[PDB]
């Protein structure tokens, strides 16, 4: 049989090919003399239709189309970290090095990992010749980075007994590090495995999620928490801040590694990440280190060929599942699933398939469903026990800014967390622009055990916060018809603490040194003071409105204007300059100042 | 008997989303099933959606990825999709195709049944009458479920319909003055946390020895979801109509089922109904939903509570819309009540139960039940109207009576609707709470209740 067929026809990112009898659907296929990369989307006889992961302009009828047998797949091994890859796994740093160009050439075949690098390999010592071994077994560490120890492990399809294991030493992506036997058949392995991106990497179990995905943003971490192992969406119109949330999680979170997935995103975003992340630093064990060591970027900028958006999203999650199997609490920024759905619209349009809503294919809901649900907290495969997790955050971008959007409508049926952004907040430069009325998190019932163990006071505060923030909108619909003179003193206090919680708690200028991040202790300290003022002010009115000596919101403001100013000032406390005990001591002094002032009013 | 050997073909002339297009086929049947064997030797089942001469369009249940237009060995069974069934399916979990996913063996059949069932003769439908206490006042009082009723839970995305359905599965039973349901559960396209929630709850409640869960997770292939609810209902009909069981059938999301019909229908280039679903969605949903209720000479009975993720929160979307025409009412779970922390979030107004009037009265319930429900319902509706008036004309424009309807609305949501996750309130306790709320108004305001019923139950 022929290893290649021939291009029967072309239409944008679709290429039909003749002499393709015996092709497999979703087989990876090279197209054209320049060896474009693509994948078979349909079969129609002795003939195939290929989605092409580069722009086809220049492909000719009768060009060679070369089969490969393999489905779309990623190389996994040492040297992933800190790199940037396109949607078809080509490492952009090595493209830049080999070509010296400002642009990615069509037809580049650069190896997904730098097979020239001798990495330091540390075999597990527990393994030896004749030992039994199974998919997910860690045969050795590689000291890839000062942060991330890479934990090499047997490919999930593989099982057998150890024929050979390499001694401690330096090796690369072609050096044989392990050899198995199964059923009398030998199987050599290098440090690099390869995995089909469309097939889920399996696990021993998917557990419930029960540890907060700590995020720099107050409103997120306090009022709508994500969880390590949970999904999330950030639907927002253009310029709403969803990309800055996505940056902020990546820059500052308890995630052990981040895969960021620039699917159809503006190019300066990748430049901003690559500018900021080598210079920003975390700390481990008394060593400060560059956060890029704990990341990888999958990039596919908005002008790169539409099809590669699909391969990009599947690459980002497949890398995430690889690091999950190492026991890292992975996080993965799916930086726009609507621009992904638009790529599925494109291929569907070329295939002439029947569209569902707004031109999207009917399988969009099914593709999105089978993607976000690749998240979880997992008992890994294999023998040394690990609890890895993937957490997936999807920056949905609704066309026209309207949540009736089919991508949003599907996404909300799948994700356990909704951080719906409001363009009206973004217009006011209120950021992060999270609408607290429509947003929700389903994980609160699981996380409440963690808050009970570490922050027992918090669940009352979170409840009072959400309620005050709802009562504001309940009052607004009245005030807009009659004016503020209609309000009772309880209502004025409600609107004032809502204004504190809105303008000084929920508001956070994430590029500034003081709002860069916010520890939970700072976050609860701020919210605790604000709600302590609410309860004390409310109590003071309720205590005295039974008499002619009635306290009022204006009486409180005129006696306690400095306290309102101190409460507003709480956001400016800086974790680099101020210790947790120092910030907490200042907040205790605010509680005492409030109590002594209210004791003088009552 | 299948005394003749099965044919097999390597004639896959096309592969197109979920469709495999065979050719050179001899005498195919519509709805026949096939075992595709891939190049790697793995097995995928499919069902014939169309035939014409030598050509047959196979729908593939385990998804089409890896199928090959020369190597794919496709084995025809000669027959339609019959599931095995037995009472041993209780105390177990299965995937949507009907294979085991616990450690246990395949089902050892007491019989084979066509998953489509067979039309129950209308003459033989015994009318539903016994009310089920679900334990939730909002669906035991102001609405009720008859044993044999088809009454789905409509819910928007993110709402606590899981907690409602599981609360029903814990609590629900006949009115007291061996008997408990076997619960057949089918999950279509569920998120893992939903799968875990039910799978855990049946085991943690200890009732697992009398239930049967079909699971299809969101990451299981789309087309399997087409079988999944019909498979479950076939298990329900076996247990009920042949083994006398009272069965409760829970379907977890008919929207992820309707999306599966949309996906294959789109791939078939079929003429669409509204929102691009197949135009046959109504008859298709009917062959699922109508498979319920007691039959002549049996004691056995199937109650269905299908659950349905209302897309974009829209009650008029075709999936809930067509369902409402087939199901004997609905229970509606509302974002507004959920945002107000009212658990369960059941909006009693658009909630309806066509059989409820026949399930209530002396000997079935306390004799006040019908009257109390009608009065409470009208009061809640007037409550929502005066709540809008509090903005549009102002609180100062409300009369003392409108303020009583506003007080009623508040107290009603706080006490009538709000249950907590384990409070198994009796119908009797629900009507006591009903009167304790009606007691807010002067006796003469209660225009929906007869003066005899008021004289017996208002002065309490």
């Amino acid at each position: 049989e022929s290893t290649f067929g021939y291009v029967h026809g072309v239409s944008g990112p679709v290429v039909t090919a003749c002499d393709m009898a015996g092709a497999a659907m979703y087989e990876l296929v090279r197209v054209g003399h320049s060896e474009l990369v693509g994948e078979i989307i349909r079969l129609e006889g002795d003939m195939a239709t290929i989605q092409v992961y580069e722009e086809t302009s220049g492909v000719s009828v009768g060009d060679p189309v070369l089969r490969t047998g393999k489905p779309l797949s990623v190389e996994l091994g040492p040297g992933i970290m800190g790199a940037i890859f396109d949607g078809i796994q080509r490492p952009l740093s090595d493209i830049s090095s080999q070509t010296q160009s400002i642009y990615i050439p069509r037809g580049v075949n650069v190896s997904a990992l730098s097979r020239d690098i001798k990495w330091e390999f540390i075999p597990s010592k527990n393994l030896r010749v004749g030992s039994h071994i199974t998919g997910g077994d860690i045969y050795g560490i590689v000291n890839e980075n000062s942060l991330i120890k890479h934990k090499i492990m047997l490919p999930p399809r593989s099982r057998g007994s150890v024929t050979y294991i390499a001694p401690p030493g330096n090796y690369d992506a072609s050096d044989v590090v392990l050899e198995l036997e199964f059923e009398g058949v030998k199987e050599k392995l290098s440090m690099v495995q390869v995995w089909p991106v469309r097939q889920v990497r399996p696990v021993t179990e998917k557990l419930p999620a029960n540890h907060p995905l700590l995020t720099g943003q107050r409103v997120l971490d306090a009022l709508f928490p994500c969880v390590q192992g949970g999904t999330t969406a950030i639907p927002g119109a253009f310029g709403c801040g969803k990309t800055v949330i996505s940056q902020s999680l990546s820059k500052y979170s308890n995630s052990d590694v981040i895969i960021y997935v620039g699917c159809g995103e503006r190019g300066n975003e990748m430049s901003e990440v690559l500018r900021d992340f080598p210079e920003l630093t975390m700390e481990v064990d008394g060593k400060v280190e560059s956060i890029m060591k704990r990341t990888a970027l999958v990039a596919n900028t908005s002008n790169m060929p539409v099809a590669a958006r699909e391969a990009s999203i599947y690459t980002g999650i497949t890398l995430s599942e690889y690091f999950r199997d190492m026991g890292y609490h992975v996080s993965m920024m799916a930086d726009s699933t609507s621009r992904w759905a638009e790529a599925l619209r494109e291929i569907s349009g070329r295939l002439a398939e029947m569209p569902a809503d707004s031109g999207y294919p009917a399988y969009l809901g099914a593709r999105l469903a089978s993607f976000y649900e690749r998240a979880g907290r997992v008992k890994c495969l294999g023998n040394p026990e690990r609890e890895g997790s993937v957490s997936i955050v999807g920056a949905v971008s609704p066309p026209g800014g309207d949540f009736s959007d089919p991508v949003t409508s599907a996404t909300l049926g799948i994700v356990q967390v909704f951080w719906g952004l409001d363009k009206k907040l973004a217009q006011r430069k209120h950021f992060p622009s999270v609408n607290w009325l429509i947003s929700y998190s389903k994980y609160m019932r699981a996380l409440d055990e963690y808050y009970d163990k570490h922050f027992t006071e918090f669940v009352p505060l979170r409840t009072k916060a959400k309620e005050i923030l709802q009562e504001e909108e309940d009052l607004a619909e009245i005030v807009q018809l009659v004016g503020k003179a209609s309000l009772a003193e309880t209502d004025k206090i409600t609107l004032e603490v809502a204004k504190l919680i809105k303008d000084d708690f929920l508001q956070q200028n994430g590029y500034t040194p003081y709002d860069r991040f916010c520890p939970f202790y700072k976050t609860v300290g701020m919210l605790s003071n604000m709600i302590s003022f609410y309860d004390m002010a409310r109590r003071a009115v309720e205590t005295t409105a039974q008499s002619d000596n009635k306290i009022t919101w204006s009486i409180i403001r005129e006696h306690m204007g400095e306290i309102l100013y101190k409460l507003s000032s709480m956001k400016f406390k800086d974790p680099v300059k101020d210790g947790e005990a120092k910030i907490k001591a200042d907040y205790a002094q605010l509680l005492e100042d409030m109590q002594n002032a209210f004791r003088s009013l009552e | 008997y299948l005394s003749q050997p099965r044919l097999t073909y390597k004639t896959v002339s096309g592969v197109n989303g979920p469709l495999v297009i065979l050719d050179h086929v001899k005498f195919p049947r519509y709805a026949e099933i096939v075992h595709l064997t891939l190049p790697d030797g793995t097995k995928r089942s499919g069902q014939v959606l169309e035939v014409s001469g030598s050509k047959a369009v196979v729908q593939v249940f385990e998804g089409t990825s890896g199928i090959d237009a020369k190597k794919t060995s496709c084995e025809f069974t000669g027959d339609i999709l019959r599931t095995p069934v037995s009472e041993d399916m209780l105390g177990r979990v299965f995937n949507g195709s009907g294979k085991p996913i616990d450690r246990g063996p395949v089902v050892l059949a007491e019989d084979f049944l066509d998953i489509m069932g067979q039309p129950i003769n209308p003459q033989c439908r015994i009318y539903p009458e016994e009310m089920i206490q679900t334990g939730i006042s909002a669906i035991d009082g102001m609405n009720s479920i008859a044993r044999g009723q088809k009454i789905p839970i409509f819910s928007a995305a993110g709402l606590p319909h899981n907690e409602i359905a599981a609360q029903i599965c814990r609590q629900a039973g006949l009115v007291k003055k061996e008997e408990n349901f076997a619960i057949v559960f089918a999950a279509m396209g569920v998120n893992m946390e939903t799968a875990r929630f039910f799978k855990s709850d049946f085991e943690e409640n200890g009732s697992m020895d009398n239930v049967c869960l079909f699971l299809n997770l969101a990451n299981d292939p789309t087309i399997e979801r087409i079988i999944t609810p019909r498979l479950a209902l076939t298990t329900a009909e076996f247990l009920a109509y042949q083994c006398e069981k009272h069965v409760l059938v829970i379907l977890t999301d008919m929207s992820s089922y309707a999306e599966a019909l949309r996906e294959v229908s789109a791939a078939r280039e079929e003429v669409p109904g509204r929102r691009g679903f197949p135009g046959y969605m109504y008859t298709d949903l009917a062959t699922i939903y109508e498979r319920a209720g007691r039959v002549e000479g049996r004691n056995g009975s199937i109650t269905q509570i299908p659950i349905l993720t209302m897309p974009n929160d829209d009650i008029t979307h075709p999936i809930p819309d067509l369902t409402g025409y087939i199901t004997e009412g609905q229970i509606y779970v509302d974002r507004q009540l959920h945002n107000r922390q009212i658990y369960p979030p059941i909006n009693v107004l658009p909630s309806l139960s066509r059989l409820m009037k026949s399930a209530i009265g002396e000997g079935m319930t306390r004799k006040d039940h019908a009257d109390v429900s009608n009065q409470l319902y009208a009061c809640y509706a007037i409550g929502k109207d005066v709540q809008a008036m509090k903005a549009v004309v102002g609180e100062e424009a409300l009369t003392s009576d409108d303020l009583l309807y506003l007080e009623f609305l508040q107290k009603f949501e706080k006490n009538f609707i709000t249950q907590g996750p384990y409070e198994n309130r009796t119908v009797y306790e629900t009507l006591d709470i009903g009167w304790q709320l009606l007691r807010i108004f002067p006796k003469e305001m209660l225009k929906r209740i007869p003066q005899s019923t008021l004289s017996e139950f208002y002065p309490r």
Binding site: A352, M354, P355, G359 | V271, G276
Partner: peptide
């Protein structure tokens, strides 16, 4: 309109192919 336009084009293609199959 778009779904019906595509249905109508698919029918036209199927008609043309069905007449070609008379040979």
């Amino acid at each position: 309109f778009y779904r019906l336009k595509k249905i109508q084009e698919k029918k036209k293609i199927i008609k043309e192919k069905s007449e070609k199959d008379l040979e």
